Amino acid sequence: ATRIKNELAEFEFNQVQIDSLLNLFEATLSFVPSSTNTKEIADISLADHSRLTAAFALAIYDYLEDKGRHNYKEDLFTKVSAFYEEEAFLLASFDLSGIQDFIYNINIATNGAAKQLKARSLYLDFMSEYIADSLLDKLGLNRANMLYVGGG
RNA sequence: AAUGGGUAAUUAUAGCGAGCUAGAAAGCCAAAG
Numbered sequence: 507a508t509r510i511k512n513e514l515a516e517f518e519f520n521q522v523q524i525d526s527l528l529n530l531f532e533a534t535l536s537f538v539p540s541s542t543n544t545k546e547i548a549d550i551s552l553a554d555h556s557r558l559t560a561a562f563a564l565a566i567y568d569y570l571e572d573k574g575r576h577n578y579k580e581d582l583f584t585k586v587s588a589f590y591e592e593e594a595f596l597l598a599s600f601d602l603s604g605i606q607d608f609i610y611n612i613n614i615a616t617n618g619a620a621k622q623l624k625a626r627s628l629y630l631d632f633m634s635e636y637i638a639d640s641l642l643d644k645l646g647l648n649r650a651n652m653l654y655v656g657g658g
Numbered sequence: 659a660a661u662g663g664g665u666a667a668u669u670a671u672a673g674c675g676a677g678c679u680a681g682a683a684a685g686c687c688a689a690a691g
């Protein structure tokens with residue numbers, strides 16, 4: 507808690523610093539549970555649970571501000587079981603193809619052998635990173651919605 | 659007693675039965691670019 511209070515003080519809430527706050531949770535709160543007085547939710551960390559809750563809560567707003575509603579107590583608080591059945595979320599994805607054809611393009615008599623092998627598998631890691639972080643600001647979203655990123 | 663003859667046994671016994679050092683190096687290539 508003192509690690510939180512030292513870095514939450516001198517801090518600004520904007521898209522410039524929309525992303526340093528997430529690592530402040532994903533490092534510090536990475537092992538702290540959520541709602542410990544329970545019988546089922548024993549393993550959902552507060553770094554992940556706050557990351558998913560902020561991921562959904564933006565997507566309700568982009569689902570509702572496009573349909574044209576402005577009040578939030580009749581389609582959320584009373585029509586909760588209707589929203590439990592209402593399809594309101596996409597699970598997007600992507601798949602970067604041709605990764606090993608690009609990484610393992612090394613051959614005998616390659617003038618840079620291991621440096622190009624360590625660069626190309628890092629290059630496609632940033633490319634798989636930038637496909638995420640450029641789709642989210644083309645939209646109105648950010649790194650909470652990205653549930654995973656890996657090898658493509 | 660003379661005289662005629664040799665007869666049987668053993669045919670090697672007990673051990674050691676290989677030990678240690680080396681078990682692929684240097685180039686090409688790749689690296690350095």
Ligand SMILES: Nc1ncnc2c1ncn2[C@@H]1O[C@H](COP(=O)(O)OP(=O)(O)OP(=O)(O)O)[C@@H](O)[C@H]1O
Binds near residue numbers: 605656657
């Ligand atoms: N960035 C990466 N670096 C290293 N290895 C990777 C990377 N991305 C994927 N791989 C490895 O390559 C395998 C498959 O990669 P591939 O490019 O065939 O994916 P894919 O095209 O989605 O395959 P499929 O068409 O069968 O779904 C994975 O099992 C993974 O181990």
